[PDB]
Design a binder for this molecule. Sequence first.
Ligand SMILES: [Zn+2]
Ligand SMILES: [Zn+2]
Ligand SMILES: [Zn+2]
Ligand SMILES: [Zn+2]
Ligand SMILES: [Zn+2]
Ligand SMILES: [Zn+2]
Lengths: 229, 231
Amino acid sequence: GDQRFGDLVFRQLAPNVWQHTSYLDMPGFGAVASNGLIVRDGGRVLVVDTAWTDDQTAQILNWIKQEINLPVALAVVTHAHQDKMGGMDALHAAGIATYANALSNQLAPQEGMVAAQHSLTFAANGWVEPATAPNFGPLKVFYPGPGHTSDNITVGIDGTDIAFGGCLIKDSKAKSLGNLGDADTEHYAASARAFGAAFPKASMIVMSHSAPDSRAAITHTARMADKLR
Amino acid sequence: ETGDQRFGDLVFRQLAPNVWQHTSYLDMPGFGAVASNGLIVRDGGRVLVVDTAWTDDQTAQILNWIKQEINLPVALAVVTHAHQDKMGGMDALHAAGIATYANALSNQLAPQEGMVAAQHSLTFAANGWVEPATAPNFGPLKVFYPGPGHTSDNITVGIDGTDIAFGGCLIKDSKAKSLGNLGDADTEHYAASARAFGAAFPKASMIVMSHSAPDSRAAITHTARMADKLR
Ligand SMILES: [Zn+2]
Ligand SMILES: [Zn+2]
Ligand SMILES: [Zn+2]
Ligand SMILES: [Zn+2]
Ligand SMILES: [Zn+2]
Ligand SMILES: [Zn+2]
C-alpha cells in the first residue's frame, strides 16, 4: 500500500485521504519519519503539515500533481517545529495559502520557521473560530490545549473515520512521548484527552511519529502523560 | 505609603489621574502574605478593571471601594491569565454584573487551573495585538499577547493616554534575584515574550506588575536578562 516517490512515502487511508511521510536524519536517532495528510475535497486538495524540508515539500506538490491532479487550495500546519513547518517556503513559492495557529505564527521566528500567511484563532472550547478558517472544507481544526507544545493543533477529517493528532499523540506501542523539550508537562494529559473527546467517533488516529493506530493511541498517550505531573 | 488608601483587606494607590493600582494579599498562616497588583481605570463615565484579587471577598472589596471613591459604574474587567491572583475573584465580578474578558486560552485553561472562566474570550493576531472585534468598547485598554512566558496564556495591557503599561505576572522588578513562580512557565520563550511586551508599549515609562511595586522600563530588560538564563 505504500508508494515511494522520490525520498517520500505516500499511503492512501480513505478514498479522499492520503498520508505523506518524509524523513530526516537526526544524530543518535537516525532517520526520523514525520507524517502529515493530503485531502481531496471536490476539485481542490488540502494539505496538513509540510515535510521536514522545502525540497521534500515540493515533492509532496509533485506527487499531488501526478496522483490527484487538482490544485492545492491551502495548507494548515500543526505547530512551529521543523517536521511540521520546515517546508513553508515551498508552499509560498507555489502561491499556496498557508494557515497556522496564530501562536505558531508568533513563535515561528524563535523556532527558525517561516510563518504561515494566515492565523487561526480558537474559542474557549478549543474549536477554531470559523471566520479564521476560510473554505477549510472537511478539515475541522481543534486546539486541545498545551501539550507537545503550547501551540499544537489537531485536525479531524469530516466525512471520514480519521483524526490527526500531529505530534501530540503517539501510538499504543510507544514507550515515550517523543520530544518533550517544548512540552507542557502539567497540561499534556488533559490536552490529549480533549483531543479524543473532540473527535469522539474517529477510529483511525493519524499522528506525526507513529503509523496510524486505533483510539487506544489517545488513551495510552494520556496515561503516559499522567506520569509527567 | 503616604497617599495610599485602605478598604478592608485591600490597598489602593493612585498612579495617574484616572488610574489606580489595587493590591490584595494571600495569607498563608505561618509564612506571611503574598501581594498581587491589578489596575482600576476611569474612562469618562465608567470604570474598567484589570485583574481580580485573590478571592471573591477581596474582589468585592475592590468594587465597593470603587463605588465609595469613584462612584462610576464598572463596565468591564480584563483578567490577565488563569491563576488565582488574577482570576480568583471572577464570581464576585459576575455577581456584580460586570462583563468579563480573558484570553480564550485562559478561559480554556480555567477549569484545569481551578478558576471560573470569563464570559468572553479575547483572541490575538500573530503579532500579538488583540483582534479588535473580540475587545469591544475597551476605551483606553490596549491588550497585547506577548507570547508564552510566566504562563502560556499571559496577556498584558497598555493604558492609552498615560505612561502606564501593565505586565502582570510576566514582568518582575529590576532588583529581582529570580523570576518567581515558574511552575507553569515557558522557559524557552520567556525572554522573547518579555522583550515583546517592551516593544509593544515602547513609550510606557511606568511599568506595573503583579508582584512588585511600579518600576521604570528597567523592569522589562532585567526580567528578560533573568529569563535568558532559563534557556
Ligand atoms: Zn514538535
Ligand atoms: Zn514532531
Ligand atoms: Zn522550541
Ligand atoms: Zn500566574
Ligand atoms: Zn501572579
Ligand atoms: Zn497550573
